[PDB]
């Protein structure tokens, strides 16, 4: 049961890392575009 | 036992991805601020 619970919790961690990576990809892309546009 | 060991190792991997995401959030934020300040 502890092992199932750990995987459940680790999926939530992975979902949060995915959210953060997507935020950062969009923000680095906006900066790259800003510098191209300047 | 292999399954417990895999989750232990995968937690260490998740901790390293978290470290890297935090480094990148701080560095993209510093760049955004630098460009705002220019």
């Amino acid at each position: 049961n502890n092992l199932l619970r750990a995987i459940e919790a680790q999926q939530h961690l992975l979902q949060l890392t995915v959210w953060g990576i997507k935020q950062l990809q969009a923000r680095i892309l906006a900066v790259e575009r800003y510098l191209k546009d300047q | 036992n292999n399954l417990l060991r895999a989750i232990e190792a995968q937690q260490h991997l998740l901790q390293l991805t978290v470290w890297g995401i935090k480094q990148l959030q701080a560095r993209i934020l510093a760049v955004e601020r630098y460009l705002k300040d220019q």
Binding site: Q10, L13 | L14
Partner: peptide, 23 residues
């Protein structure tokens, strides 16, 4: 991240960026 990380430690032994850090 801290909340889930703490839980997993215990189990294995046995949106904003502030909230992201907490979870």
């Amino acid at each position: 991240x801290n909340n889930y990380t703490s839980l997993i430690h215990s189990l294995i032994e046995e949106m904003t960026w502030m909230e992201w850090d907490r979870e």
